[PDB]
PDB file of all heavy atoms in Angstrom:
ATOM      1  N   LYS A  79      26.364 -71.535  27.756  1.00  0.00           N
ATOM      2  CA  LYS A  79      26.380 -73.005  27.599  1.00  0.00           C
ATOM      3  C   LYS A  79      25.058 -73.459  26.887  1.00  0.00           C
ATOM      4  O   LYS A  79      24.982 -74.643  26.527  1.00  0.00           O
ATOM      5  CB  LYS A  79      26.611 -73.725  28.859  1.00  0.00           C
ATOM      6  CG  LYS A  79      27.851 -73.232  29.632  1.00  0.00           C
ATOM      7  CD  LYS A  79      29.183 -73.640  28.868  1.00  0.00           C
ATOM      8  CE  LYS A  79      30.357 -73.004  29.576  1.00  0.00           C
ATOM      9  NZ  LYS A  79      30.661 -73.611  30.877  1.00  0.00           N
ATOM     10  N   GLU A  80      24.158 -72.647  26.787  1.00  0.00           N
ATOM     11  CA  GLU A  80      22.797 -72.950  26.213  1.00  0.00           C
ATOM     12  C   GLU A  80      22.168 -71.700  25.615  1.00  0.00           C
ATOM     13  O   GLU A  80      22.109 -70.697  26.198  1.00  0.00           O
ATOM     14  CB  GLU A  80      21.904 -73.551  27.304  1.00  0.00           C
ATOM     15  CG  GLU A  80      20.747 -74.367  26.746  1.00  0.00           C
ATOM     16  CD  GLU A  80      19.511 -73.560  26.435  1.00  0.00           C
ATOM     17  OE1 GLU A  80      19.434 -72.423  26.869  1.00  0.00           O
ATOM     18  OE2 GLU A  80      18.648 -74.087  25.716  1.00  0.00           O
ATOM     19  N   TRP A  81      21.669 -71.921  24.395  1.00  0.00           N
ATOM     20  CA  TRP A  81      20.922 -70.857  23.687  1.00  0.00           C
ATOM     21  C   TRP A  81      20.448 -71.402  22.341  1.00  0.00           C
ATOM     22  O   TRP A  81      21.074 -72.265  21.727  1.00  0.00           O
ATOM     23  CB  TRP A  81      21.815 -69.622  23.377  1.00  0.00           C
ATOM     24  CG  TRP A  81      23.185 -69.939  22.701  1.00  0.00           C
ATOM     25  CD1 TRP A  81      24.393 -70.220  23.346  1.00  0.00           C
ATOM     26  CD2 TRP A  81      23.397 -70.118  21.269  1.00  0.00           C
ATOM     27  NE1 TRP A  81      25.342 -70.517  22.411  1.00  0.00           N
ATOM     28  CE2 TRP A  81      24.805 -70.441  21.207  1.00  0.00           C
ATOM     29  CE3 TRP A  81      22.658 -69.994  20.090  1.00  0.00           C
ATOM     30  CZ2 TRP A  81      25.453 -70.633  19.932  1.00  0.00           C
ATOM     31  CZ3 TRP A  81      23.279 -70.177  18.896  1.00  0.00           C
ATOM     32  CH2 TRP A  81      24.664 -70.519  18.792  1.00  0.00           C
ATOM     33  N   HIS A  82      19.363 -70.836  21.868  1.00  0.00           N
ATOM     34  CA  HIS A  82      18.808 -71.171  20.520  1.00  0.00           C
ATOM     35  C   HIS A  82      18.283 -69.884  19.883  1.00  0.00           C
ATOM     36  O   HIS A  82      17.576 -69.153  20.490  1.00  0.00           O
ATOM     37  CB  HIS A  82      17.775 -72.256  20.563  1.00  0.00           C
ATOM     38  CG  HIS A  82      18.339 -73.617  20.952  1.00  0.00           C
ATOM     39  ND1 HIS A  82      18.570 -73.990  22.194  1.00  0.00           N
ATOM     40  CD2 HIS A  82      18.761 -74.679  20.184  1.00  0.00           C
ATOM     41  CE1 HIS A  82      19.100 -75.187  22.277  1.00  0.00           C
ATOM     42  NE2 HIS A  82      19.187 -75.652  20.980  1.00  0.00           N
ATOM     43  N   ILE A  83      18.588 -69.675  18.627  1.00  0.00           N
ATOM     44  CA  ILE A  83      18.238 -68.472  17.880  1.00  0.00           C
ATOM     45  C   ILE A  83      17.791 -68.826  16.464  1.00  0.00           C
ATOM     46  O   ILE A  83      18.118 -69.921  15.964  1.00  0.00           O
ATOM     47  CB  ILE A  83      19.363 -67.436  17.879  1.00  0.00           C
ATOM     48  CG1 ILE A  83      20.621 -67.991  17.160  1.00  0.00           C
ATOM     49  CG2 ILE A  83      19.665 -66.928  19.237  1.00  0.00           C
ATOM     50  CD1 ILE A  83      21.705 -66.975  16.919  1.00  0.00           C
ATOM     51  N   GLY A  84      17.063 -67.909  15.808  1.00  0.00           N
ATOM     52  CA  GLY A  84      16.722 -68.087  14.412  1.00  0.00           C
ATOM     53  C   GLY A  84      15.492 -67.232  14.107  1.00  0.00           C
ATOM     54  O   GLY A  84      15.368 -66.101  14.497  1.00  0.00           O
ATOM     55  N   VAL A  85      14.612 -67.800  13.293  1.00  0.00           N
ATOM     56  CA  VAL A  85      13.365 -67.124  12.898  1.00  0.00           C
ATOM     57  C   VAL A  85      12.193 -68.025  13.121  1.00  0.00           C
ATOM     58  O   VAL A  85      12.271 -69.255  13.138  1.00  0.00           O
ATOM     59  CB  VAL A  85      13.365 -66.686  11.406  1.00  0.00           C
ATOM     60  CG1 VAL A  85      14.442 -65.584  11.220  1.00  0.00           C
ATOM     61  CG2 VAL A  85      13.536 -67.832  10.468  1.00  0.00           C
ATOM     62  N   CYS A  86      11.025 -67.449  13.291  1.00  0.00           N
ATOM     63  CA  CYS A  86       9.779 -68.147  13.377  1.00  0.00           C
ATOM     64  C   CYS A  86       8.681 -67.395  12.681  1.00  0.00           C
ATOM     65  O   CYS A  86       8.719 -66.184  12.522  1.00  0.00           O
ATOM     66  CB  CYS A  86       9.352 -68.521  14.826  1.00  0.00           C
ATOM     67  SG  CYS A  86       8.854 -67.129  15.845  1.00  0.00           S
ATOM     68  N   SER A  87       7.618 -68.132  12.266  1.00  0.00           N
ATOM     69  CA  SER A  87       6.425 -67.538  11.666  1.00  0.00           C
ATOM     70  C   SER A  87       5.659 -66.703  12.665  1.00  0.00           C
ATOM     71  O   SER A  87       5.605 -67.012  13.843  1.00  0.00           O
ATOM     72  CB  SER A  87       5.529 -68.641  11.114  1.00  0.00           C
ATOM     73  OG  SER A  87       4.278 -68.085  10.745  1.00  0.00           O
ATOM     74  N   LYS A  88       5.085 -65.636  12.157  1.00  0.00           N
ATOM     75  CA  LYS A  88       4.190 -64.743  12.942  1.00  0.00           C
ATOM     76  C   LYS A  88       3.025 -65.560  13.584  1.00  0.00           C
ATOM     77  O   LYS A  88       2.569 -65.294  14.627  1.00  0.00           O
ATOM     78  CB  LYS A  88       3.622 -63.638  12.094  1.00  0.00           C
ATOM     79  CG  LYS A  88       2.728 -62.653  12.842  1.00  0.00           C
ATOM     80  CD  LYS A  88       2.221 -61.550  11.908  1.00  0.00           C
ATOM     81  CE  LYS A  88       1.380 -60.551  12.678  1.00  0.00           C
ATOM     82  NZ  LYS A  88       0.985 -59.452  11.772  1.00  0.00           N
ATOM     83  N   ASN A  89       2.625 -66.645  12.857  1.00  0.00           N
ATOM     84  CA  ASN A  89       1.510 -67.475  13.234  1.00  0.00           C
ATOM     85  C   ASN A  89       1.859 -68.765  14.006  1.00  0.00           C
ATOM     86  O   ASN A  89       0.981 -69.684  14.056  1.00  0.00           O
ATOM     87  CB  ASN A  89       0.647 -67.797  11.987  1.00  0.00           C
ATOM     88  CG  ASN A  89       0.084 -66.579  11.341  1.00  0.00           C
ATOM     89  OD1 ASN A  89      -0.360 -65.670  11.984  1.00  0.00           O
ATOM     90  ND2 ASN A  89       0.093 -66.560   9.984  1.00  0.00           N
ATOM     91  N   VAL A  90       3.031 -68.801  14.653  1.00  0.00           N
ATOM     92  CA  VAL A  90       3.329 -69.964  15.532  1.00  0.00           C
ATOM     93  C   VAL A  90       2.431 -70.014  16.729  1.00  0.00           C
ATOM     94  O   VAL A  90       1.847 -69.030  17.148  1.00  0.00           O
ATOM     95  CB  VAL A  90       4.803 -69.977  15.959  1.00  0.00           C
ATOM     96  CG1 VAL A  90       5.716 -70.204  14.775  1.00  0.00           C
ATOM     97  CG2 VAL A  90       5.194 -68.705  16.706  1.00  0.00           C
ATOM     98  N   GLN A  91       2.236 -71.213  17.269  1.00  0.00           N
ATOM     99  CA  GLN A  91       1.466 -71.402  18.450  1.00  0.00           C
ATOM    100  C   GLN A  91       2.266 -70.846  19.629  1.00  0.00           C
ATOM    101  O   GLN A  91       3.393 -71.339  19.945  1.00  0.00           O
ATOM    102  CB  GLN A  91       1.115 -72.881  18.662  1.00  0.00           C
ATOM    103  CG  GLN A  91       0.167 -73.142  19.851  1.00  0.00           C
ATOM    104  CD  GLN A  91      -0.143 -74.677  19.971  1.00  0.00           C
ATOM    105  OE1 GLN A  91      -0.458 -75.329  18.986  1.00  0.00           O
ATOM    106  NE2 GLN A  91      -0.122 -75.108  21.265  1.00  0.00           N
ATOM    107  N   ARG A  92       1.713 -69.821  20.293  1.00  0.00           N
ATOM    108  CA  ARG A  92       2.405 -69.142  21.411  1.00  0.00           C
ATOM    109  C   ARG A  92       1.921 -69.658  22.801  1.00  0.00           C
ATOM    110  O   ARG A  92       2.621 -69.429  23.795  1.00  0.00           O
ATOM    111  CB  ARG A  92       2.290 -67.608  21.325  1.00  0.00           C
ATOM    112  CG  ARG A  92       2.744 -67.127  19.971  1.00  0.00           C
ATOM    113  CD  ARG A  92       2.873 -65.565  19.980  1.00  0.00           C
ATOM    114  NE  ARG A  92       3.029 -65.067  18.643  1.00  0.00           N
ATOM    115  CZ  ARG A  92       3.468 -63.846  18.329  1.00  0.00           C
ATOM    116  NH1 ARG A  92       3.714 -62.999  19.286  1.00  0.00           N
ATOM    117  NH2 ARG A  92       3.538 -63.462  17.062  1.00  0.00           N
ATOM    118  N   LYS A  93       0.712 -70.254  22.812  1.00  0.00           N
ATOM    119  CA  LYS A  93       0.196 -70.720  24.061  1.00  0.00           C
ATOM    120  C   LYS A  93       0.229 -72.258  24.098  1.00  0.00           C
ATOM    121  O   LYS A  93      -0.163 -72.941  23.110  1.00  0.00           O
ATOM    122  CB  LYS A  93      -1.282 -70.272  24.209  1.00  0.00           C
ATOM    123  CG  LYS A  93      -1.484 -68.758  24.016  1.00  0.00           C
ATOM    124  CD  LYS A  93      -0.798 -67.896  25.037  1.00  0.00           C
ATOM    125  CE  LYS A  93      -1.053 -66.435  24.873  1.00  0.00           C
ATOM    126  NZ  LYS A  93      -0.250 -65.604  25.857  1.00  0.00           N
ATOM    127  N   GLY A  94       0.660 -72.792  25.178  1.00  0.00           N
ATOM    128  CA  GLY A  94       0.851 -74.256  25.340  1.00  0.00           C
ATOM    129  C   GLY A  94       2.109 -74.748  24.551  1.00  0.00           C
ATOM    130  O   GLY A  94       2.883 -73.920  24.093  1.00  0.00           O
ATOM    131  N   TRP A  95       2.266 -76.063  24.506  1.00  0.00           N
ATOM    132  CA  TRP A  95       3.452 -76.665  23.930  1.00  0.00           C
ATOM    133  C   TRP A  95       3.195 -77.173  22.470  1.00  0.00           C
ATOM    134  O   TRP A  95       2.232 -77.728  22.203  1.00  0.00           O
ATOM    135  CB  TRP A  95       4.010 -77.791  24.775  1.00  0.00           C
ATOM    136  CG  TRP A  95       5.272 -78.381  24.235  1.00  0.00           C
ATOM    137  CD1 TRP A  95       6.594 -78.029  24.434  1.00  0.00           C
ATOM    138  CD2 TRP A  95       5.316 -79.547  23.261  1.00  0.00           C
ATOM    139  NE1 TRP A  95       7.463 -78.894  23.824  1.00  0.00           N
ATOM    140  CE2 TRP A  95       6.746 -79.800  23.054  1.00  0.00           C
ATOM    141  CE3 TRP A  95       4.406 -80.405  22.698  1.00  0.00           C
ATOM    142  CZ2 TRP A  95       7.204 -80.832  22.238  1.00  0.00           C
ATOM    143  CZ3 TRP A  95       4.873 -81.432  21.856  1.00  0.00           C
ATOM    144  CH2 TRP A  95       6.228 -81.623  21.668  1.00  0.00           C
ATOM    145  N   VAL A  96       4.191 -76.812  21.653  1.00  0.00           N
ATOM    146  CA  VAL A  96       4.330 -77.407  20.341  1.00  0.00           C
ATOM    147  C   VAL A  96       5.844 -77.574  20.167  1.00  0.00           C
ATOM    148  O   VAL A  96       6.618 -76.811  20.660  1.00  0.00           O
ATOM    149  CB  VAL A  96       3.688 -76.603  19.237  1.00  0.00           C
ATOM    150  CG1 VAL A  96       4.619 -75.496  18.669  1.00  0.00           C
ATOM    151  CG2 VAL A  96       3.133 -77.477  18.115  1.00  0.00           C
ATOM    152  N   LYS A  97       6.271 -78.661  19.469  1.00  0.00           N
ATOM    153  CA  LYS A  97       7.729 -78.874  19.235  1.00  0.00           C
ATOM    154  C   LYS A  97       8.276 -77.759  18.333  1.00  0.00           C
ATOM    155  O   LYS A  97       7.659 -77.490  17.301  1.00  0.00           O
ATOM    156  CB  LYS A  97       7.952 -80.282  18.689  1.00  0.00           C
ATOM    157  CG  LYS A  97       9.390 -80.733  18.923  1.00  0.00           C
ATOM    158  CD  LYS A  97       9.615 -82.156  18.493  1.00  0.00           C
ATOM    159  CE  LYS A  97      11.015 -82.682  18.923  1.00  0.00           C
ATOM    160  NZ  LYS A  97      11.251 -84.036  18.577  1.00  0.00           N
ATOM    161  N   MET A  98       9.403 -77.269  18.670  1.00  0.00           N
ATOM    162  CA  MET A  98      10.054 -76.251  17.865  1.00  0.00           C
ATOM    163  C   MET A  98      10.779 -76.858  16.720  1.00  0.00           C
ATOM    164  O   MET A  98      11.951 -77.329  16.808  1.00  0.00           O
ATOM    165  CB  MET A  98      11.007 -75.329  18.750  1.00  0.00           C
ATOM    166  CG  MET A  98      10.214 -74.359  19.565  1.00  0.00           C
ATOM    167  SD  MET A  98      11.257 -73.279  20.633  1.00  0.00           S
ATOM    168  CE  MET A  98      12.286 -72.489  19.371  1.00  0.00           C
ATOM    169  N   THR A  99      10.031 -76.943  15.600  1.00  0.00           N
ATOM    170  CA  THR A  99      10.459 -77.573  14.367  1.00  0.00           C
ATOM    171  C   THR A  99      10.027 -76.727  13.188  1.00  0.00           C
ATOM    172  O   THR A  99       9.091 -75.942  13.341  1.00  0.00           O
ATOM    173  CB  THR A  99       9.874 -78.976  14.168  1.00  0.00           C
ATOM    174  OG1 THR A  99       8.423 -78.860  14.139  1.00  0.00           O
ATOM    175  CG2 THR A  99      10.255 -79.898  15.298  1.00  0.00           C
ATOM    176  N   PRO A 100      10.684 -76.877  11.995  1.00  0.00           N
ATOM    177  CA  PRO A 100      10.200 -76.163  10.746  1.00  0.00           C
ATOM    178  C   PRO A 100       8.741 -76.448  10.453  1.00  0.00           C
ATOM    179  O   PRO A 100       7.999 -75.513   9.994  1.00  0.00           O
ATOM    180  CB  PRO A 100      11.052 -76.715   9.708  1.00  0.00           C
ATOM    181  CG  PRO A 100      12.390 -77.030  10.435  1.00  0.00           C
ATOM    182  CD  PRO A 100      11.928 -77.526  11.774  1.00  0.00           C
ATOM    183  N   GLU A 101       8.303 -77.630  10.692  1.00  0.00           N
ATOM    184  CA  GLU A 101       6.851 -78.028  10.444  1.00  0.00           C
ATOM    185  C   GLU A 101       5.907 -77.206  11.268  1.00  0.00           C
ATOM    186  O   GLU A 101       4.769 -76.976  10.872  1.00  0.00           O
ATOM    187  CB  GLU A 101       6.669 -79.530  10.811  1.00  0.00           C
ATOM    188  CG  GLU A 101       7.278 -80.502   9.823  1.00  0.00           C
ATOM    189  CD  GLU A 101       8.792 -80.699   9.922  1.00  0.00           C
ATOM    190  OE1 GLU A 101       9.361 -80.284  10.919  1.00  0.00           O
ATOM    191  OE2 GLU A 101       9.369 -81.277   9.003  1.00  0.00           O
ATOM    192  N   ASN A 102       6.343 -76.745  12.444  1.00  0.00           N
ATOM    193  CA  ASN A 102       5.535 -75.869  13.315  1.00  0.00           C
ATOM    194  C   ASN A 102       5.950 -74.417  13.231  1.00  0.00           C
ATOM    195  O   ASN A 102       5.422 -73.541  13.987  1.00  0.00           O
ATOM    196  CB  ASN A 102       5.696 -76.339  14.788  1.00  0.00           C
ATOM    197  CG  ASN A 102       4.949 -77.645  14.996  1.00  0.00           C
ATOM    198  OD1 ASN A 102       3.896 -77.934  14.466  1.00  0.00           O
ATOM    199  ND2 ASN A 102       5.527 -78.535  15.894  1.00  0.00           N
ATOM    200  N   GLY A 103       6.741 -74.113  12.228  1.00  0.00           N
ATOM    201  CA  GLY A 103       7.023 -72.705  11.950  1.00  0.00           C
ATOM    202  C   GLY A 103       8.245 -72.084  12.624  1.00  0.00           C
ATOM    203  O   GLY A 103       8.338 -70.891  12.821  1.00  0.00           O
ATOM    204  N   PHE A 104       9.153 -72.954  13.081  1.00  0.00           N
ATOM    205  CA  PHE A 104      10.415 -72.502  13.732  1.00  0.00           C
ATOM    206  C   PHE A 104      11.613 -72.945  12.941  1.00  0.00           C
ATOM    207  O   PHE A 104      11.765 -74.134  12.612  1.00  0.00           O
ATOM    208  CB  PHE A 104      10.491 -73.126  15.179  1.00  0.00           C
ATOM    209  CG  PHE A 104       9.428 -72.645  16.112  1.00  0.00           C
ATOM    210  CD1 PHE A 104       8.207 -73.318  16.182  1.00  0.00           C
ATOM    211  CD2 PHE A 104       9.572 -71.522  16.912  1.00  0.00           C
ATOM    212  CE1 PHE A 104       7.201 -72.944  17.107  1.00  0.00           C
ATOM    213  CE2 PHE A 104       8.615 -71.057  17.814  1.00  0.00           C
ATOM    214  CZ  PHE A 104       7.409 -71.832  17.895  1.00  0.00           C
ATOM    215  N   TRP A 105      12.488 -72.028  12.639  1.00  0.00           N
ATOM    216  CA  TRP A 105      13.724 -72.328  11.964  1.00  0.00           C
ATOM    217  C   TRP A 105      14.873 -71.821  12.835  1.00  0.00           C
ATOM    218  O   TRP A 105      15.288 -70.714  12.729  1.00  0.00           O
ATOM    219  CB  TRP A 105      13.822 -71.730  10.588  1.00  0.00           C
ATOM    220  CG  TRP A 105      12.774 -72.285   9.632  1.00  0.00           C
ATOM    221  CD1 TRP A 105      12.914 -73.325   8.743  1.00  0.00           C
ATOM    222  CD2 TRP A 105      11.416 -71.853   9.453  1.00  0.00           C
ATOM    223  NE1 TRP A 105      11.780 -73.605   8.072  1.00  0.00           N
ATOM    224  CE2 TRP A 105      10.781 -72.705   8.441  1.00  0.00           C
ATOM    225  CE3 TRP A 105      10.591 -70.836   9.995  1.00  0.00           C
ATOM    226  CZ2 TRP A 105       9.487 -72.541   8.069  1.00  0.00           C
ATOM    227  CZ3 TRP A 105       9.319 -70.679   9.633  1.00  0.00           C
ATOM    228  CH2 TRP A 105       8.772 -71.552   8.613  1.00  0.00           C
ATOM    229  N   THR A 106      15.359 -72.733  13.675  1.00  0.00           N
ATOM    230  CA  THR A 106      16.308 -72.345  14.749  1.00  0.00           C
ATOM    231  C   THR A 106      17.439 -73.327  14.833  1.00  0.00           C
ATOM    232  O   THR A 106      17.353 -74.497  14.444  1.00  0.00           O
ATOM    233  CB  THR A 106      15.644 -72.245  16.109  1.00  0.00           C
ATOM    234  OG1 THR A 106      15.002 -73.457  16.404  1.00  0.00           O
ATOM    235  CG2 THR A 106      14.648 -71.088  16.123  1.00  0.00           C
ATOM    236  N   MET A 107      18.587 -72.865  15.351  1.00  0.00           N
ATOM    237  CA  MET A 107      19.686 -73.745  15.789  1.00  0.00           C
ATOM    238  C   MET A 107      20.292 -73.183  17.058  1.00  0.00           C
ATOM    239  O   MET A 107      19.971 -72.066  17.487  1.00  0.00           O
ATOM    240  CB  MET A 107      20.759 -73.834  14.661  1.00  0.00           C
ATOM    241  CG  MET A 107      21.552 -72.562  14.331  1.00  0.00           C
ATOM    242  SD  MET A 107      22.800 -72.043  15.511  1.00  0.00           S
ATOM    243  CE  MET A 107      23.799 -73.512  15.646  1.00  0.00           C
ATOM    244  N   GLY A 108      21.140 -73.975  17.705  1.00  0.00           N
ATOM    245  CA  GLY A 108      21.784 -73.513  18.948  1.00  0.00           C
ATOM    246  C   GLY A 108      22.631 -74.499  19.586  1.00  0.00           C
ATOM    247  O   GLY A 108      23.068 -75.452  19.037  1.00  0.00           O
ATOM    248  N   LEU A 109      22.825 -74.267  20.918  1.00  0.00           N
ATOM    249  CA  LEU A 109      23.728 -75.030  21.771  1.00  0.00           C
ATOM    250  C   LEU A 109      23.012 -75.485  23.046  1.00  0.00           C
ATOM    251  O   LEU A 109      22.207 -74.750  23.582  1.00  0.00           O
ATOM    252  CB  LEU A 109      24.914 -74.135  22.137  1.00  0.00           C
ATOM    253  CG  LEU A 109      26.003 -74.735  23.095  1.00  0.00           C
ATOM    254  CD1 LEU A 109      26.668 -75.900  22.517  1.00  0.00           C
ATOM    255  CD2 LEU A 109      26.951 -73.597  23.470  1.00  0.00           C
ATOM    256  N   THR A 110      23.279 -76.747  23.441  1.00  0.00           N
ATOM    257  CA  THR A 110      22.841 -77.224  24.731  1.00  0.00           C
ATOM    258  C   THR A 110      24.020 -77.959  25.397  1.00  0.00           C
ATOM    259  O   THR A 110      24.882 -78.449  24.728  1.00  0.00           O
ATOM    260  CB  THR A 110      21.643 -78.231  24.523  1.00  0.00           C
ATOM    261  OG1 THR A 110      20.689 -77.674  23.638  1.00  0.00           O
ATOM    262  CG2 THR A 110      20.990 -78.517  25.865  1.00  0.00           C
ATOM    263  N   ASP A 111      23.960 -77.946  26.770  1.00  0.00           N
ATOM    264  CA  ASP A 111      24.973 -78.675  27.577  1.00  0.00           C
ATOM    265  C   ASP A 111      26.413 -78.330  27.251  1.00  0.00           C
ATOM    266  O   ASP A 111      27.341 -79.136  27.260  1.00  0.00           O
ATOM    267  CB  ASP A 111      24.756 -80.181  27.476  1.00  0.00           C
ATOM    268  CG  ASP A 111      23.455 -80.651  28.089  1.00  0.00           C
ATOM    269  OD1 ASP A 111      22.900 -79.988  29.036  1.00  0.00           O
ATOM    270  OD2 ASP A 111      22.900 -81.661  27.675  1.00  0.00           O
ATOM    271  N   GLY A 112      26.646 -77.031  26.803  1.00  0.00           N
ATOM    272  CA  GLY A 112      27.993 -76.523  26.669  1.00  0.00           C
ATOM    273  C   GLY A 112      28.669 -76.874  25.322  1.00  0.00           C
ATOM    274  O   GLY A 112      29.396 -76.023  24.793  1.00  0.00           O
ATOM    275  N   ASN A 113      28.399 -78.071  24.811  1.00  0.00           N
ATOM    276  CA  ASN A 113      29.097 -78.506  23.560  1.00  0.00           C
ATOM    277  C   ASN A 113      28.257 -79.269  22.577  1.00  0.00           C
ATOM    278  O   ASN A 113      28.799 -79.880  21.659  1.00  0.00           O
ATOM    279  CB  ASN A 113      30.312 -79.305  24.001  1.00  0.00           C
ATOM    280  CG  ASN A 113      30.044 -80.548  24.830  1.00  0.00           C
ATOM    281  OD1 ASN A 113      28.884 -80.946  24.923  1.00  0.00           O
ATOM    282  ND2 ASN A 113      31.050 -81.091  25.461  1.00  0.00           N
TER     283      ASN A 113
END
């Protein structure tokens, strides 16, 4: 009912929070709340 997959840059921030967006080096899609 929930999952996200894709690719990210080797140089993404791995410690602490950053929003998972292309601007931050994440290219992902997925599913939340079943639908």
Side-chain angles (χ1 to χ4, degrees):
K79 306 293 173 69
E80 200 275 344
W81 52 267
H82 293 81
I83 61 173
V85 296
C86 70
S87 170
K88 181 179 182 177
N89 297 320
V90 292
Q91 190 178 312
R92 303 191 193 194
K93 310 294 181 184
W95 180 90
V96 87
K97 200 174 188 179
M98 284 179 60
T99 60
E101 287 78 13
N102 290 322
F104 297 89
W105 296 267
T106 56
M107 66 76 53
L109 176 65
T110 314
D111 294 334
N113 59 15

